[PDB]
């Protein structure tokens, strides 16, 4: 049978079971041949695949289709023995997520899918045939893979010439090499987003070279030390520079030359001083300077020099006071300084009529300036765990305000004027139930009437 059925994975039969097989063969080999198909792992795997296809019908997967963060159809396969053949009939699928699928082979039937753009290989080593690999080389945008060993990553990852986003969340640090595993990353000329997470010690030379055409570089070392040493000066078109948990301990000196940057995030880098805003003046297009989850004693005066700030983030820091020069920036919209040792906000905040979202959570803010409420373009204000004794009645003049939070405050009075707003619902204004009763009910009943839809 092994020389005829081409199934060499039929183990030899031991004593007390080879004897009866020999007797049956002495009767006729037909029974032995028909029985041997239940001793081969290949037939067992084929039966598993067929039962998976029959059990996971097209309708069940279609109903299981979900929408991801980017608002597109996504299918999640977790711990399945394989990919059902009915899955590759979902031409409307756009993202295919595979997690903990053993010995997965991507069949040529993936070409039947046309809207597929992202492939998620979570701890799955996928082996792909030529017709399917050509389709992936032509019709795959992003590739997310998680792994523990360098060898269990696909070897055809560098063959995806149309790839745009690459997400590595493994451990690329091999044995005494400068990340030779990804030395083929230079092949990808269409790469736009890189999402390395391997606890980098020295930034790979291949990544520094390939970043000359990279848009969003996001790195996470989980607090592992990373040294730059004039590595980003080669890039000229980088816009996002997330370096969350990279243990830089300081803002790198090579980030100044990246004038094209617009988003910078250095969360959990254990920074000490951010006086480098004076050197940051090169970046005229910077609008999303993020530095939260860090430890900075105070905000330097050089923030006011930059006037293009729109997304300012210093949350979960220990900053005792806000210098008045920071308020010079007239285009802040997503300013959030939460979980900070603040005592009060200067009245210069009221000159920022362009503010949309503000978070002053976990701040010892006794009161707010009436000049702050004079702006009319506010959208959301999160105020959690703040020592507030009263709320000014002038907030009722806010019409564009969509939502506010007063949870954790030591409040006992809510102005009646707060209920006069064109846009006001239960979801937007959530406060303590006892404090909710201090307003007259004739407006609450009308609000509840319109809360349906």
């Amino acid at each position, epitope marked *: 049978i092994r020389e005829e059925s081409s199934y060499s994975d039929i183990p030899d039969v031991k004593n007390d079971f080879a004897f009866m097989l020999h007797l049956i063969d002495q009767y006729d080999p037909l029974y032995s041949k028909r029985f041997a198909v239940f001793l081969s792992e290949v037939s067992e795997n084929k039966l598993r695949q067929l039962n998976l296809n029959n059990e996971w019908t097209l309708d069940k997967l279609r109903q299981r289709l979900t929408k991801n963060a980017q608002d597109k159809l996504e299918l999640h396969l977790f711990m399945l023995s394989g990919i059902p053949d009915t899955v590759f009939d979902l031409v409307e699928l756009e993202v295919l997520k595979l997690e903990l699928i053993p010995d997965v082979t991507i069949p040529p039937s993936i070409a039947q899918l046309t809207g597929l753009k992202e492939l998620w290989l979570y701890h799955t080593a996928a*082996k792909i045939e*030529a017709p399917a*690999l*050509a389709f992936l*080389r032509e019709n795959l945008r992003a590739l997310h893979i998680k792994f523990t060993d360098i060898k269990e990553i696909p*070897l*055809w990852i*560098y*063959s995806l010439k149309t790839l745009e986003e690459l997400h590595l969340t493994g451990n690329l640090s*091999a*044995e*005494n*090499n*400068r990340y*030779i595993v990804i*030395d*083929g990353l*230079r*092949e990808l*000329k269409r790469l736009k987003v890189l999402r390395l997470k391997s606890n980098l010690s020295k930034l790979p*030379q291949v990544v520094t*070279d390939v970043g000359v055409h990279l848009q969003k570089l996001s790195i996470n070392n989980e607090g592992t030390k990373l040294i730059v040493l004039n590595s980003l000066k080669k890039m000229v078109n980088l816009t996002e520079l997330e370096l969350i948990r990279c243990d830089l301990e300081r803002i790198p000196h090579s980030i100044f030359s990246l004038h094209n940057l617009q988003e910078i995030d250095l969360k959990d880098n254990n920074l000490k001083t951010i006086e480098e805003i004076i050197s940051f003046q090169h970046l005229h297009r910077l609008t999303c300077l993020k530095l939260w989850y860090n430890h900075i004693a105070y905000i330097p005066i050089q923030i006011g020099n930059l006037t293009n700030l729109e997304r300012l983030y210093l949350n979960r820091n220990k900053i005792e006071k806000i210098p008045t020069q920071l308020f010079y920036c007239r285009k802040l919209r997503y300013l959030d300084l939460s979980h900070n040792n603040l005592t009060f906000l200067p009245a210069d905040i009221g000159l920022l009529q362009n503010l949309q979202n503000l978070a002053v959570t976990a701040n010892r803010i006794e009161a707010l300036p009436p000049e702050l409420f004079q702006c009319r373009k506010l959208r959301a204000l999160h105020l959690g765990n703040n020592v507030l004794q009263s709320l000014p009645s002038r907030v009722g003049e806010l019409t564009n305000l969509t939502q506010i939070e007063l949870r954790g405050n030591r409040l006992e009075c809510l102005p009646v004027e707060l209920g006069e707003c064109p846009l006001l619902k239960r979801s937007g204004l959530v406060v303590e139930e006892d404090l909710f009763s201090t307003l007259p009910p004739e407006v609450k009943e009308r609000l509840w009437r319109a809360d349906k839809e």
Partner: nanobody
Framework: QVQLVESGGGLVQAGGSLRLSCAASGFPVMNAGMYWYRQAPGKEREWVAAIESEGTSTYYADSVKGRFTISRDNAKNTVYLQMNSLKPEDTAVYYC??????????????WGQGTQVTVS
């Protein structure tokens, strides 16, 4: 078939120049990324030279910056690597490598046999 074969192996004392080469079978060299790696006894493979596909741009490791010269010759369908008075500490076994040629089958990366160059 697809395979790489290189030559030029020979023990050369410090003070001269050695001209390496390669030979690609089954695929054009212009539409492919060619790499040069080095191997040493008791040491893991280290990247040396890379020439990019679709634009022919050279890439060197920080250890070998500004000393080697790599070129692609489509007439012979080969890649030429030339050093400049290589040090005895650079004595190693050089490996050719091209990954993900236009043909996409199970072997995605192809390596040469390997040539040992000795400097003392």
């Amino acid at each position: 078939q697809v395979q790489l074969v290189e030559s030029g192996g020979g023990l050369v004392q410090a003070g001269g120049s050695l001209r390496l080469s390669c030979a690609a079978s089954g695929f054009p060299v212009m539409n492919a990324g060619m790499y040069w790696y080095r191997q040493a006894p008791g040491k893991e493979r280290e990247w040396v030279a890379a020439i990019e596909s679709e634009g022919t741009s050279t890439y060197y490791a920080d250890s070998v910056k500004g000393r080697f010269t790599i070129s692609r010759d489509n007439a012979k369908n080969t890649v030429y690597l030339q050093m400049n008075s290589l040090k005895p500490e650079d004595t190693a076994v050089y490996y050719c490598n091209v990954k993900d040629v236009g043909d996409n089958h199970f072997p995605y990366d192809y390596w040469g046999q390997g040539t040992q160059v000795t400097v003392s």
